[PDB]
Design a protein around this ligand. Sequence first.
Ligand SMILES: Cc1ncc(COP(=O)(O)O)c(CNCCCCN)c1O
Ligand SMILES: Cc1ncc(COP(=O)(O)O)c(CNCCCCN)c1O
Lengths: 381, 378
Amino acid sequence: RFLEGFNTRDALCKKISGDPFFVADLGDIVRKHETWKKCLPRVTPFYAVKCNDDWRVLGTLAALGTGFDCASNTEIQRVRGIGVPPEKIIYANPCKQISHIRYARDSGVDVMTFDCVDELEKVAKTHPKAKMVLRISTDLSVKFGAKVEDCRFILEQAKKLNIDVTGVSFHVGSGSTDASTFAQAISDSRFVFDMGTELGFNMHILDIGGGFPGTRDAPLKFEEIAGVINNALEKHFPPDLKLTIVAEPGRYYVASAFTLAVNVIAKKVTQSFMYYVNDGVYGSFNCILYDHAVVRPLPQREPIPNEKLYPSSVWGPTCDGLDQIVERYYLPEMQVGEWLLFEDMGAYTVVGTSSFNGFQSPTIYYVVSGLPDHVVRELKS
Amino acid sequence: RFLEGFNTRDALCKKISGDPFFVADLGDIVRKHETWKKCLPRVTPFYAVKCNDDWRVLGTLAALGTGFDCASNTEIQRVRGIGVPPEKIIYANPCKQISHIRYARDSGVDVMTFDCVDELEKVAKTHPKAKMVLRISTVKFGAKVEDCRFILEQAKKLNIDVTGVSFHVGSGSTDASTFAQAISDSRFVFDMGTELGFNMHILDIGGGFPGTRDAPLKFEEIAGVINNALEKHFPPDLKLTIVAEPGRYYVASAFTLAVNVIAKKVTQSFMYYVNDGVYGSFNCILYDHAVVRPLPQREPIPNEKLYPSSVWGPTCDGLDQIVERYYLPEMQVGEWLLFEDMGAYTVVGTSSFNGFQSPTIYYVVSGLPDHVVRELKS
Ligand SMILES: Cc1ncc(COP(=O)(O)O)c(CNCCCCN)c1O
Ligand SMILES: Cc1ncc(COP(=O)(O)O)c(CNCCCCN)c1O
């Protein structure tokens, strides 16, 4: 649960006294929100719940006033479960199961995305009055996003289906090494947005998606992206009382808020070492296979002046020979029972865990700050 | 639970008349065991629970008298839970967390594997009388034969009761000779142990046997090669017990996955989106190197047109893709796609990413006399 020391690492050390565990700094989320409002004041964040759905994480973003981008009936139910109103929810999954569409309608959720005519046929039969946002491609592109040269036809069909199209959205992804992708997407969005107005639609939403860095270390900084985004916005979507700009950041808000502590449960010496820890690719580190993550092990032990360092490998618990976390990283000699830390483990980690081999995912502990007493009391319930 | 039907397909059709679901034929497991006893009469199977720990699957294997290979306190707890005695359990994980070793001890489980001296130092402090089995290499696990003498000498210093040798060739074999080589290598280590005075009486040949009677390297061919090697290096003897840790062998073909087409896009090719994917049942594609084949559950029509098509999972991940280019007849949203041979390393590696829930499991039992009664009454 909640512990003290108002620094995630002191709380973690204080805690250490052999099961793996997370220390999540809810206070880091508050800080990320302050930076969002400062760098993207025109954009309302709808947190991508899929990135990390921990209840304290959702309760925190909710009290900070963010919206939520949900992808299934389960996520909508989770968000509505903590008392968040349906207007603060966007169903941003382009290809939805009919019964899930029915659940959203019955829950009061009306904004959804789509990227082809087939989806509109479903909405027509199931949630006729839904406010639909057309998601365009950013050349993940093979899977979702209508090509710009197909949008006129798609909108025509929407008119025939009597669909209330109200915006345009896109998602560049996190694999960009240049913010220019956002500028080009915002330009394409203007073109489709105008086509909708041309055909008689009430276009009032621009959704710029996710893909913003969650670790203030990455090559392409958040600030540089916000600058490129703001300029494209000024040029193609000048401020207007009928226009609302939103985004679906997921990793941006939580990547750096979670630090994982694993225990060295076994060791082999060969001059190199092999450490086995009690979390791996089937657990928290599934992010390595599914999210292309690269991790760095950090000894929890306070360093000793001139310790010798050796080429080491770190392995998960599992029988699988592919369950390897680190291939060759320099670490001082570790002892079974000591701990290794992994920072920036808040995004696409706990949500992709499985109980393969019967191992249980790490318990999550919390440290908090930057929030009112009454809100903390809600987070602790 | 149990579905009305004489077949998997028959049961499927019944039920269908849109959440994804599994139909597991417990009867296919019974037949795999019969085939095992026929081709490997000298080898006692200890089912690798990690492969698929479904409660009915375990109860069935248990009634068939198999043993169980467990990898954590959780799996030991589960097998002991259905009433299996500790002696029919082998803790086959080479690098165990201390509290887990302690748990096995307190549960009466004494046979454990190891592949280095450090693991023995832990055992000596937590489970001093455990019967230890030395696992040899065939880079994550397995001691090299060249290093076994030193390891055995250290085990004697730690007063460890080393009782055998084990190995695991894995599923990636195009040649059964790999089993012969591993059995030969095990003889070398068995002898070093006897020479140092250990009571070597267990040979554990591991897993890796095919679970789908279609694979290139057939189970019977492997059994033949194993039996010849066993005769040459480990002649019958009442003091010697030969065991194995088959996993996929027993359950791969027992499960059929039925998923629903929830969205479709046309480009003359089609893109279908189903309600299970790489984060769910198809995690096996990423973790187990599996290849799947979608089958329309719809009864075919004469000369239907077939088109190159892709199948995608329900998730936001552009990598959540099941099939790249497979010829299927035009499908409609709401229609079902079946995936056969989905019992191994599927339900165990599932996650609830994007909030999607894993498919529920239903059971049927074909080709068996009213033994069906026994299995359904557990
Ligand atoms: C439509 C959509 N909207 C938001 C996000 C969040 O992305 P993020 O980089 O800010 O966290 C996504 C993410 N999609 C796939 C993530 C896969 C991670 N391995 C999205 O599709
Ligand atoms: C030590 C050991 N024993 C048995 C098995 C079961 O193998 P199988 O091919 O017969 O099912 C294993 C397998 N471990 C890893 C499976 C990963 C699947 N992606 C094993 O290590």
